[PDB]
Amino acid sequence: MAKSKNHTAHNQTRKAHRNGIKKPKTYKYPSLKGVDAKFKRNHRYALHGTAKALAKARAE
Amino acid sequence: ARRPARCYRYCKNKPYPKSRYNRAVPDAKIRIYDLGRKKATVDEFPLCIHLVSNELEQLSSEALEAARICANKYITKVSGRDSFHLRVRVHPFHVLRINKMLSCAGADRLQQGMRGAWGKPHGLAARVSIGQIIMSARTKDSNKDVVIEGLRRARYKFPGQQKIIISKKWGFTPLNRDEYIAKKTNGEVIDDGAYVKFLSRKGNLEANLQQFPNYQYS
Amino acid sequence: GKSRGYRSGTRYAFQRDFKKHGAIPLSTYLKVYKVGDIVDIKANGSIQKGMPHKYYHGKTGIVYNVTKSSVGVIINKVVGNRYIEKRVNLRVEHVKHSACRQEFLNRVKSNAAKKREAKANGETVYLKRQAAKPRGSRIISTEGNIPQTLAPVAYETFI
Amino acid sequence: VNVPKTRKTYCKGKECRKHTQHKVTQYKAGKASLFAQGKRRYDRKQSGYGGQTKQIFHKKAKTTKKVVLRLECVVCKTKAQLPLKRCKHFELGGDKKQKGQALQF
RNA sequence: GCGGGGUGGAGCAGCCUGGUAGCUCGUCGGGCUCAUAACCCGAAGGUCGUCGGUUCAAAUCCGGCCCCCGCAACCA
RNA sequence: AACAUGUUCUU
RNA sequence: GCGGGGUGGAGCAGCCUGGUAGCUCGUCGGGCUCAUAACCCGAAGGUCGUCGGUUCAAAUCCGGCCCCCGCAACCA
RNA sequence: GGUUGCGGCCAUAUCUAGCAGAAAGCACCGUUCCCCGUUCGAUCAACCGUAGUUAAGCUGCUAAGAGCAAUACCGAGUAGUGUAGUGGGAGACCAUACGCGAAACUAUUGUGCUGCAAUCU
RNA sequence: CCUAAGGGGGACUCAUGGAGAACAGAAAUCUCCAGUAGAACAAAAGGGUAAAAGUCCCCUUGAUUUUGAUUUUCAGUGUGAAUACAAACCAUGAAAGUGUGGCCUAUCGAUCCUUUAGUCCCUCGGAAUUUGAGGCUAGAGGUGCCAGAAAAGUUACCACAGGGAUAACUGGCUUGUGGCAGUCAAGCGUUCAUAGCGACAUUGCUUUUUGAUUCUUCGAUGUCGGCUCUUCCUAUCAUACCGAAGCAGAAUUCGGUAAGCGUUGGAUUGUUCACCCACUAAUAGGGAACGUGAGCUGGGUUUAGACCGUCGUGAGACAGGUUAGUUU
RNA sequence: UGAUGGUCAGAAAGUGAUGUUGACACAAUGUGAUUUCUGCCCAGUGCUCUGAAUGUCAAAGUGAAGAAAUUCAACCAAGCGCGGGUAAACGGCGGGAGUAACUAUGACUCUCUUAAGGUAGCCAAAUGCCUCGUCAUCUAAUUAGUGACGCGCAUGAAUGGAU
RNA sequence: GGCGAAAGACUAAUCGAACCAUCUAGUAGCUGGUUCCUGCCGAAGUUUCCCUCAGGAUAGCAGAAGCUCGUAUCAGUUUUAUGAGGUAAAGCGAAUGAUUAGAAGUCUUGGGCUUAACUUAUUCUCAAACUUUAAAUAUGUAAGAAGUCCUUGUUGCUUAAUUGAACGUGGACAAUUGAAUGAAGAGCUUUUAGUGGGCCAUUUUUGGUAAGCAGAACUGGCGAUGCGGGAUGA
RNA sequence: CCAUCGACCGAUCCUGAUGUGUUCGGAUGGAUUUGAGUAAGAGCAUAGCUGUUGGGACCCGAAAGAUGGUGAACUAUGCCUG
Numbered sequence A: 001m002a003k004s005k006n007h008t009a010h011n012q013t014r015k016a017h018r019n020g021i022k023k024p025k026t027y028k029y030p031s032l033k034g035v036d037a038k039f040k041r042n043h044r045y046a047l048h049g050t051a052k053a054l055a056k057a058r059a060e
Numbered sequence B: 001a002r003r004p005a006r007c008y009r010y011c012k013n014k015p016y017p018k019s020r021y022n023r024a025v026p027d028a029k030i031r032i033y034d035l036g037r038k039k040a041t042v043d044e045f046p047l048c049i050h051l052v053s054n055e056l057e058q059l060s061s062e063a064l065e066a067a068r069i070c071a072n073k074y075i076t077k078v079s080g081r082d083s084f085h086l087r088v089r090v091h092p093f094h095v096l097r098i099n100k101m102l103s104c105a106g107a108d109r110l111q112q113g114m115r116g117a118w119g120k121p122h123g124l125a126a127r128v129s130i131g132q133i134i135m136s137a138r139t140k141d142s143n144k145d146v147v148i149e150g151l152r153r154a155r156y157k158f159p160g161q162q163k164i165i166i167s168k169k170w171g172f173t174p175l176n177r178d179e180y181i182a183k184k185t186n187g188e189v190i191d192d193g194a195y196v197k198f199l200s201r202k203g204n205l206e207a208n209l210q211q212f213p214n215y216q217y218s
Numbered sequence C: 001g002k003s004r005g006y007r008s009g010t011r012y013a014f015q016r017d018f019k020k021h022g023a024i025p026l027s028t029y030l031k032v033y034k035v036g037d038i039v040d041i042k043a044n045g046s047i048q049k050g051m052p053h054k055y056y057h058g059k060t061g062i063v064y065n066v067t068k069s070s071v072g073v074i075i076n077k078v079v080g081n082r083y084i085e086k087r088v089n090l091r092v093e094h095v096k097h098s099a100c101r102q103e104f105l106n107r108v109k110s111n112a113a114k115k116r117e118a119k120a121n122g123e124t125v126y127l128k129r130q131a132a133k134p135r136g137s138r139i140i141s142t143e144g145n146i147p148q149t150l151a152p153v154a155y156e157t158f159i
Numbered sequence D: 001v002n003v004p005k006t007r008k009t010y011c012k013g014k015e016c017r018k019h020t021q022h023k024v025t026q027y028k029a030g031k032a033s034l035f036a037q038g039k040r041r042y043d044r045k046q047s048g049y050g051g052q053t054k055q056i057f058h059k060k061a062k063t064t065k066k067v068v069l070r071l072e073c074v075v076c077k078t079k080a081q082l083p084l085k086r087c088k089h090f091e092l093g094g095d096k097k098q099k100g101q102a103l104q105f
Numbered sequence E, G: 001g002c003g004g005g006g007u008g009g010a011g012c013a014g015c016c017u018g019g020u021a022g023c024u025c026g027u028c029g030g031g032c033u034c035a036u037a038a039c040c041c042g043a044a045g046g047u048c049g050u051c052g053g054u055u056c057a058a059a060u061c062c063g064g065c066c067c068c069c070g071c072a073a074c075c076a
Numbered sequence F: 001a002a003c004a005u006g007u008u009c010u011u
Numbered sequence H: 001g002g003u004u005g006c007g008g009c010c011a012u013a014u015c016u017a018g019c020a021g022a023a024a025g026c027a028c029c030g031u032u033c034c035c036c037g038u039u040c041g042a043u044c045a046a047c048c049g050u051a052g053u054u055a056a057g058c059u060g061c062u063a064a065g066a067g068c069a070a071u072a073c074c075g076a077g078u079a080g081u082g083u084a085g086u087g088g089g090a091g092a093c094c095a096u097a098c099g100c101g102a103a104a105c106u107a108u109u110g111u112g113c114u115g116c117a118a119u120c121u
Numbered sequence I: 001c002c003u004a005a006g007g008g009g010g011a012c013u014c015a016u017g018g019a020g021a022a023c024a025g026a027a028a029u030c031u032c033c034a035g036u037a038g039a040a041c042a043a044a045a046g047g048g049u050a051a052a053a054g055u056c057c058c059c060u061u062g063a064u065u066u067u068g069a070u071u072u073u074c075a076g077u078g079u080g081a082a083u084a085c086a087a088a089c090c091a092u093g094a095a096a097g098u099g100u101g102g103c104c105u106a107u108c109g110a111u112c113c114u115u116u117a118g119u120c121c122c123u124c125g126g127a128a129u130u131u132g133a134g135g136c137u138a139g140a141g142g143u144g145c146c147a148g149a150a151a152a153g154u155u156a157c158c159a160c161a162g163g164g165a166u167a168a169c170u171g172g173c174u175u176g177u178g179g180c181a182g183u184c185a186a187g188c189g190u191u192c193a194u195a196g197c198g199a200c201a202u203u204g205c206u207u208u209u210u211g212a213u214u215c216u217u218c219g220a221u222g223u224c225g226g227c228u229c230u231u232c233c234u235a236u237c238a239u240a241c242c243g244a245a246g247c248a249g250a251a252u253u254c255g256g257u258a259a260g261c262g263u264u265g266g267a268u269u270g271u272u273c274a275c276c277c278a279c280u281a282a283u284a285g286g287g288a289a290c291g292u293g294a295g296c297u298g299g300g301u302u303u304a305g306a307c308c309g310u311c312g313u314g315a316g317a318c319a320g321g322u323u324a325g326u327u328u
Numbered sequence J: 001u002g003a004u005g006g007u008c009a010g011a012a013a014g015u016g017a018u019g020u021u022g023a024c025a026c027a028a029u030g031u032g033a034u035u036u037c038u039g040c041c042c043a044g045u046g047c048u049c050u051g052a053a054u055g056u057c058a059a060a061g062u063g064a065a066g067a068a069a070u071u072c073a074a075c076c077a078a079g080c081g082c083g084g085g086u087a088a089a090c091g092g093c094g095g096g097a098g099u100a101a102c103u104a105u106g107a108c109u110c111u112c113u114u115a116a117g118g119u120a121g122c123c124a125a126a127u128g129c130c131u132c133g134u135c136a137u138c139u140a141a142u143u144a145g146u147g148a149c150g151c152g153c154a155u156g157a158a159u160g161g162a163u
Numbered sequence K: 001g002g003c004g005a006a007a008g009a010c011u012a013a014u015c016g017a018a019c020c021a022u023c024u025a026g027u028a029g030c031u032g033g034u035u036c037c038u039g040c041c042g043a044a045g046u047u048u049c050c051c052u053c054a055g056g057a058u059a060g061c062a063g064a065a066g067c068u069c070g071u072a073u074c075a076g077u078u079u080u081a082u083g084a085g086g087u088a089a090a091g092c093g094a095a096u097g098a099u100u101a102g103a104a105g106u107c108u109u110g111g112g113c114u115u116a117a118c119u120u121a122u123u124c125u126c127a128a129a130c131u132u133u134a135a136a137u138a139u140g141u142a143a144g145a146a147g148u149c150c151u152u153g154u155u156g157c158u159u160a161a162u163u164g165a166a167c168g169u170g171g172a173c174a175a176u177u178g179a180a181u182g183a184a185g186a187g188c189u190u191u192u193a194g195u196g197g198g199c200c201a202u203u204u205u206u207g208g209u210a211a212g213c214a215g216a217a218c219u220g221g222c223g224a225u226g227c228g229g230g231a232u233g234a
Numbered sequence L: 001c002c003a004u005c006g007a008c009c010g011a012u013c014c015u016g017a018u019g020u021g022u023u024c025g026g027a028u029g030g031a032u033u034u035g036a037g038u039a040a041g042a043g044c045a046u047a048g049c050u051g052u053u054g055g056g057a058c059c060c061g062a063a064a065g066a067u068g069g070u071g072a073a074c075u076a077u078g079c080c081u082g
Ligand SMILES: CN[C@@H]1[C@@H](O)[C@@H](O[C@@H]2[C@@H](O)[C@H](O[C@H]3O[C@H]([C@@H](C)O)[C@@H](O)[C@H](O)[C@H]3N)[C@@H](N)C[C@H]2N)OC[C@]1(C)O
Pocket: E042, E043
């Protein structure tokens, strides 16, 4: 009495290609969320020390 | 009763053999596949005549049984039982299914129609390709036309079209008649009941030499 | 009822190769992975830990993270009308280097060397690859090679 | 399920913060007070005319419950709760399985 | 359209799953009695209703010809 | 308290 | 489509909730009687419909198959 | 070149059946106070290198050897398959055009290669 | 389901077969040999595993604490489950290591409410103390219709909104089932497959059976049978002319052209159907919206009355029976 | 149901109907003239009776603890539970085997089992599926009618049976 | 509520609960309708959840407004390099399972020279839930400036370390900046409509005897579309 | 304006100085945690189209439910008088 279509993927790729299929944008620096916490922790200090050293040598 | 054979003629379904997944399957109507003088030696029956399918279809075990009986009975009547060896070359391994709708008035009250329609086992059929040999008979060269007529009668028991082909090869061996005579006279074949064994130039040389003592190494 | 569990459909994909069961050769554990390396993902059915989902079986991606026994790999997955960046943690048994990249780095070195050779010689060379071009003209001798005529053959049966 | 009566696990008490010996008992819910706000509200809503004012669950389907272990540290007397998987039979300090003996049917 | 069945004189096995048909009642003899009845001992008794096929081998499987007894056979 | 029965036909 | 039954020669338990097959009648041996019945003292007799499975262990628990008796099959 | 220790790839290295093996190495081999483990010094432990032996392990060689590996005017451009037509055919199916392309089969060849360290007639 | 069937370490090797040892045999335990897993690993199936992931021994609680990142299902929400790290605290081992439950893929649960554990910390608002109550963090009590209402029937007295998204006719596709016709020829037919028949098989046709389906119609296509009347089909019962025979004649049987012409009267039943009686040259089968209700009839079916049986506690039910019921 | 009552009415009342009444009456049901009869079952559902002895049982009251809110305990009405009655209350009213000197049949026996196992009657009946039951009669011919028969799907005794 | 010798009858043509006014424009996931022109863009019948299945929310598809820029690196495509896969086909004198026939042994193992079993070499035939092998089509990734090389800075991470890891200073390499073809340009944001019954064709494919039947896959269509042809016809 | 590593404020976990109504205080330093925050404000007000929710809610449409009234000139039944 209410039997109807159960499933089809007809027209689905056609809809997907109207505006897709778009690759995610790439960036020079990735987010370090999800990277090993011990690496990320020390990388913080390594960047901080590098700025301090460059700020020093530029004075002289 | 049995539905007419047109209801299960063509290979529409995947093969559905008897297995762990359909156990309640009846026996095929054909039980005997080797008739005539099945103990005869390879050199006794040099001529091979095939009945070849020209259809991609399903042959019920009932048709296989009827054709076997027809051919065997005719050839035995004309040339005697020991003058040939007939081999049915297809085995019905495909199970046929049936849904079994009621044929009384008011069946629609009782039954559910196309709901849950998966069928019960009904019969067995053999799946044959175009060019597949159905039956084979080896006899002597003087018995050509008797076996040809015997197979001619069996053809009418099958749906569709079949051809009767005279083979160039010696009996049921894969060798042409001249090739078989050359292998025989060179001591490279021995009898093994109804069949033979051929010489190997591989393996232990001592066993090869013992097994075919009359071998002419060349 | 339907069944859509985590490893459904993996009967053959996660089987070990014929006569390739048992212990993992140690070369698998001696490889070194770095962030930025490109790796092929192949599930080993004998290592149940750190396994890829069947989707990532046969996919190639970038390494983004390196831990004790595993690497983090970035995979792009088509979801609807766009790609989603996926991050999968895989033990090294399920990972292998990609060979095309080694080839490409070799070509980088060769291009640099050729350019330097031309610069020392005083000229310019072309570094772009080229597709296969149509062949040029040629002369064929018939010495001991007289053209031999062929014809179609008649039909024969061999049954 | 047989679970032993003592268990050496981590203690969160500010005295310990380490693995200590614990006493294992099974948790049992206490008596519902008549002065909990939910119950004072319910009684007020049920008074007067109107009949039953709230739903009453009927379609029970589970046959088991989750067992909660009560672990008390023998040093500082801090408790911890630890739930188990569903089981139909549970006992503490039952006799351990002996391996390789003839059954005396 | 079906569903069972046709094995001694009559009731039943043997069939399922080919090679090897038995008991029961009843008849033909002896045992016992004064003679019977009963009782006991023995003995004969069906190549399977019939015609076909498959089979090395058919009461046993697969068809046809009869007899026995029935179950099912618009409708709005 | 319990205790039913006795083939046919004679000489 | 369901539901119950299948256990000594007969009619029934035991299943459930695994470890032993219990009851009445019947059968057989001896006794009491002139004899028989009743009665008394003894003895045999069900591998649990069947093929599998699990379990250390199957009448029992878990499927297929076979036979027996039943319930449901409605709105036009 | 032999051998040992630690290996990489993980049968061209495996398996059966014979035979041979100098030097060193390895091995079997002797013993039970001590550390240690056993129903048993068999295995495990320890001690001697002293009494012996290449018999076995191990290494190599042999076999119209089994297995394995490799190749191919072997089968076969076959089976299968992408694209095409108002192609053929009642249909099952088949051919053609532009492409890809097996397996079995057959025949022939091979039977570990190698890294680090030490040592040797 | 499991305190091990979880974690670590160690030693060993499994099914099965062969050959041997008192009672001892097919099956007791002891020995050796072969043994790529043919075993085992809680439980379905698939995958995985041999100095192990199996068996046995030893020690254990990582089946723990804090809170983030990720994978599957996916809206890239929730739940379930899983993966790799960080920071603790532990187990085990000589050690490298390994361990955040069960070798992997299933084994489960919001808001409100209650209850417990933790900080014993916040609040009870005129100020305090002690009871009591209320909060914060983390679990448990459960929704299996499993993203999670608190829930029995009957209507043959019935209503409304709709539905041809959907049943009860015709029609359409199909043709299993029904009906009809071929091919082969084992046998029957005194001999003889085919005068006449014809098993086992096998190819079709038809839409006069019954199903299957749900395309049309639910702002309605009048829903049985008979009566009446016309016409069509041929798969021919009779009548015309013929061919065949196991055609002497008579009778009969098989077949061809043929639908020109006919194919009846009655008992019982609402019947189509069935079944007898009888006449006849013969008493063929079918179609036309299952022809034909502004042509009839209204016996049946199928509104409301009433009775019975079985069922139901009951209201009531019943392809069970019975009687009365407006045909524009 | 004997009036301080039964049955019924009303929002209430110093309120009503039966009632100008009193068991030969009023009220509530079932069956349905006469004749002849009206079997067995109180296990179930109801209805009803008994309460000195008695588990559970509300509010109030009682005792204890507490500073108090409160908590706990005992006691505790009817009701429930326990025990009896009642079918012209609702209703209900059995299986499997064997057995006689032809055969058949089974008066007879064994066994399981209920609250009781459908008695007297009656029947293919307006109640019987199978079924157009079988036999007889009626007709030329009868799915009709009538008389018989009865393991009766699913007849049956005031849910009244047979006349 | 009445009244009923009982039909759910009768109670002013109204009765399985009269008539009148009001609450009341009661609510409806349902049926019907919904009013001028031209221009530009232009769908969906699919995903997840729902007492959800004639309805919603959610994502998708569509429009509008733009904004930041101006050839940056993009593409329903090829080439080159490199992965993954277990379908088609094939195979069964290869494992598992199925399966016809002899033959030679074994009798130490059970019957009547056999009869079956067992062993060995053979023989006919098969598999959606078998497999050593194994395509075609389809599918992942790369082809540089965010690069390569040289020197040596940072750090609490890492190494026995002066070893590494990650991010850098300074130096060098220039239009062939490292395949093809194309590019009414690229990137970014907000907001909202309709839709959430589909259906057809080739090929693959499941149930069913089959169906203008029922259910999937990829692509193209019809729906939403006229036009020439197929007489006629989504 | 965008990607990324930090810093600041509140919540959470740890640390715990000089001191003390000795149980308070919380200097200082940490932490794969957390917020609809900071880091040289952007808002408020009026108006317009579109979109949303409550309203009769685009228009017309139930079967029902409730409150207060009016009928025994028909008809049902009793009674009284013909
Ligand atoms: C009454 N006791 C009898 C005893 O006498 C005997 O009976 C035989 C019976 O078996 C015989 O029966 C046999 O007879 C012959 C047999 C001898 O081969 C067979 O051919 C025949 O088929 C078979 N019925 C019958 N012919 C005579 C009885 N007395 O065996 C049977 C028995 C029941 O024990």
